[PDB]
Amino acid sequence: EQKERKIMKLLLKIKNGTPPMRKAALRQITDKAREFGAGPLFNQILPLLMSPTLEDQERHLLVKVIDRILYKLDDLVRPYVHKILVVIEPLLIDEDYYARVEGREIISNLAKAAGLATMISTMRPDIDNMDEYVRNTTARAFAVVASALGIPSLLPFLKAVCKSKKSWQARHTGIKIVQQIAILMGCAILPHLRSLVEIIEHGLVDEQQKVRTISALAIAALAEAATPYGIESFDSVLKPLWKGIRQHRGKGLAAFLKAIGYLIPLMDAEYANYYTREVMLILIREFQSPDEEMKKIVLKVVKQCCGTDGVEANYIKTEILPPFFKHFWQHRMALDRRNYRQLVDTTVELANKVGAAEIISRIVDDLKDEAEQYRKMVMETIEKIMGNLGAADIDHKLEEQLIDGILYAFQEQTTEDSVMLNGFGTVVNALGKRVKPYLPQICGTVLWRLNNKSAKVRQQAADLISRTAVVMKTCQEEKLMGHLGVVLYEYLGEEYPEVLGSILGALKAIVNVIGMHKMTPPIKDLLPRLTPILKNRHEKVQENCIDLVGRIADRGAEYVSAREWMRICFELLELLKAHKKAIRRATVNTFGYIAKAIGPHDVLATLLNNLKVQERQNRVCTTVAIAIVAETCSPFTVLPALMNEYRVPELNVQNGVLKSLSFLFEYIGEMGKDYIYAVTPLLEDALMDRDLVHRQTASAVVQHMSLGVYGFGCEDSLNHLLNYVWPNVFETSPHVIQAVMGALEGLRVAIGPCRMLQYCLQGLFHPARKVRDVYWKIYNSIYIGSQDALIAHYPRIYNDDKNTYIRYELDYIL
């Protein structure tokens, strides 16, 4: 029919087309969703979704339009719950995290919109299906619809599903639902902990291995969810776990070990020790296992047992390490990645308790291994250990071995790894001033790496010197640092920008760490060489160069002449085009940095001349620069030039100067009480009903100034601006109404709530509706903040025949 053809055309518009067409189609379908109807629309959208050859883009658009139309139909989607679910369920098992989360959100929305009984009856026949994929999807759906509407709304159904006797599929599905609820909920199942523990406890002694394993996994999930509290709920579950530890073997043993490891931290010190002893009695013999997943499980169990505060250190050092360092430190362990990370974390936390020296002394000899992956693993191990424990316990016999190992590791590398430089920096920083006798070796090594092999490790060497400049300075060394600086100086002109950025960062770090007047190359010889670098289009080089320029301008300014600053300014005006926020902020800051040294006469003229870009990005940066230079200099030397530029008939210039005034008033803060009289006529002229943008900017200026001048008692001029701000409330554009609301809330604290209440009490009960809505919104905004202050400003209302509206308690006279 005609409706079907219209839905076809709009669906084609949504599927393929330009973004404006797609958004127009979306807005019109949201506007007319109720009129279109649900039956044909769903019968029309479902076949496209069920097609297996659907691309992800149109699938996402269809899901979005379904979300947009779902909340409009509050109760008209009840018969369609089954037909939408049978198409939407498979989206929760995909590996796409965003797809999974939006599927969970849409199923939660559908559960909230629909009814409990209808969807429960819909998913009753899904429990006994023989396919395991559909059972898993049904378990996920039950978990999300239990997160929606609350757990107690589904609690009675759990007893029915878990007490089924005809088959174990229902019990397994119920346990899976429980574990998924525990996983997806988080810490919100704490009030309903016992109600789940009692219902799940009976499954630990069943004759089926699947139900026992799934019950153990769900108990582990519950213990994970209730990490710091809940031992009283699990006190009745411990004994079956210990009974099943010895009897079970294989996957069930892994599940039981995971569960018991999760429950160990919840106990007290004495109980934790008493039970971890028995855990260790089997753990020692269980470290020998062929499967990698069992190795990961036992590593997690060891980690959790070591994390308990009830286990004392002597038992750890007497039992756990001698087999740990002999079984878990091999090449095959470093071959994998999950075992990689798990072993790294376990070793780090073990070192956090037994002692860094014992851990480190047996693995420093591992740095000489030929394998690159094993060297990486051990290097991360010491790096993480020294990141937390420092290097206050390491001894000289160990320090020299560590230095030899790290130097050997850095000398030869198969590829470029940042882990080597990160670890080297961490060890050097942790050692502190005791690495002094090894500085020449480090300097020679970094020079040798920087001097050859064609710009592959030169950037890493620059990073290393940037990291170690501080330690070389603290070790009372300046001459070789200056040699390195000058070497980087003749090594500044590279074609590759990637290494150029690193070298510039190294030079910046050298400038930061050492004095500017003691630098081996004179400061006057850098800026002429550095200016052509500003024209490069790469991001990192621009960042490093602008940071170095700002540092030089802030610190070294008496040396630099006032001739090249103009060229630097004309280059920074172009550099403001950069996309990244950091570069723009640095340029804006260095504008004020250089205008502090140089009189703000030529700087202001250059900035004011570039306010007609027609590109919004440049004008905002220019006006922020104007504000920051005005703040840095004396405000009375920069105001008249700004005001004289307002007379230009270009609206962009007026918007820019108004924004500059707003930012300047925000920056100065309490200093605005002296210049408030100057900008009053300009704000009065701007607040007139001529354009929306000008009124919005004037409202922002008023808000910022009122917030700044609070606490001084200058309401004589502030009250005059309220008479012009108030008529601008009746507007429909979101931006202007937001600005007006912000201005009113800023003025509320500056003028007092009495004037605002008097203004609001004019048409609070006006016969119209929109004005009443606006006045009530303003009254609520005033009422939320400083509610107690409204007691003394309430008007007197005379009582009627039936009610008493007079507060007689305040009429008492002494």
Partner: protein, 71 residues
């Protein structure tokens, strides 16, 4: 929709708020303000020859339903 401060807070009105609701809300707020401060309570207990406990008890009773019955 950043209006969460208005809906969650108690006492905020809207278009369909009657005069009686606003009056009773402001009366309850005034009673709470009287109870909170100490010098206002002293003034109330000096103006009429009573005790602080008696004044507090009377203010508790007056908070059940002021401004008479609703219409």
């Amino acid at each position: 929709q950043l209006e969460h401060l208005q809906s969650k807070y108690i006492g905020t009105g809207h278009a369909d708020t009657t005069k009686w609701e606003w009056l009773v809300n402001q009366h309850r707020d005034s009673y709470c303000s009287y109870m909170g401060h100490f010098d206002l309570l002293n003034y109330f207990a000096i103006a009429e020859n009573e005790s602080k406990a008696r004044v507090r008890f009377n203010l508790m009773e007056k908070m059940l339903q002021p401004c008479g019955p609703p219409a």
